[PDB]
Amino acid sequence: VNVLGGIEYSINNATLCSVGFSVTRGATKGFVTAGHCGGVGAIVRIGGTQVGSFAARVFPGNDRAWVSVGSAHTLQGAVSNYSGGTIAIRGSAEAAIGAAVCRSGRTTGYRCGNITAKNVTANYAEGAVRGLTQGNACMGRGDSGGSWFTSAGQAQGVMSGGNVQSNGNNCGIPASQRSSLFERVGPILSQYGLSLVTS
């Protein structure tokens, strides 16, 4: 199967999240995503087929993980735009507050907005997660773990949480009322010694 930022994956055949970014660790294939999407060892399926499992995770405190992907599968250094195309990923340079950013996930597809704050703490039910970046692109339950990136292709982070409304998303309110929080990708690559696949 092809691994691509933003596409749906299932966890333990029970819940859903979205791929963050294809990565490698030496010869090992994988992708980064949110830690709250799976415990260690959780079985991951994409496109009706087992592709690997949660190799490591931190959540709460942080909210990060990577899924190691079997060698039979192909990694794509890109993110889906949910209309038949992809956006190439070309690095992980972090963007400043006010910069434009988009995200991609299985519930709300491809959505854009701006970076609005950094080093935010989310008081999730499972506990605090610190150091999150906030944007005002909208998102919904199921987009978790999915790619955040600038249009020029710099990976920002993976979808963590935010102020979803009773319909399960914050797309029904204007961007100015939105709080959509992602875990910065930089420390995930560093902690686990992973390299972005680029194109």
Q: Look at the block and give the residue holding tokens 């910069």.
A: 99
Residue 142: domain span: 77-184
In degrees and rounded to multiples of 5, residue 131 shows phi and psi of 75, 20
- Count structural domains, the chain: 2
Judge if 100 and 147 occupy the same domain.
yes
Three-class SS state of 106? coil
Indicate which residue of 10, 18, 80, 144 is catalytic.
Answer: 144
Q: Is 63 a catalytic residue?
A: yes
CATH of the domain at 39: 2.40.10.10
Residue 183's DSSP bridge partners are 158
Which residues share a beta bridge with 132?
A: 120
Residue 60: cis peptide before it, omega within 30 degrees of 0: yes
Which one from 22, 36, 92, 143 is the annotated catalytic residue?
36
The closest of 89, 76, 71, 91 to 29, measured between CA atoms, is 71
CA 180 to chain centre: 12
Which residues fall within 8 angstroms of residue 48, CB to CB, at 6 or more apart?
none
The answer to whether the beta carbons of residues 158 and 32 sit under 8 Å apart is: yes
10 Å CB burial of residue 185 (0-12, 13-18, 19+) is: buried
Same domain, 27 and 92: no
User: Among this protein's residues, is 36 annotated catalytic?
Assistant: yes
55 and 36, same structural domain? yes
Half-sphere exposure of 6 (CA within 13 A, CB side): 26
What kind of experiment solved this structure? X-ray
Edge-to-edge strand ranges of the sheet holding 64-69: 15-18, 8-11, 43-46, 49-58, 64-69, 28-33, 21-25, 195-196
- The reply to whether 64 and 81 lie within a common domain is no
CA distance 163 to 40: 27
How far apart, in whole angstroms, are the C-alpha atoms of residue 68 and residue 1? Answer: 14
Rounded distance between C-alpha atoms, residue 16 and residue 36, angstroms: 11
In the chain, how long is the greatest CA-to-CA distance?
44
- Same domain membership, residue 173 and residue 84: yes
129 and 92 part of one domain: yes
Same domain for 155 and 138: yes
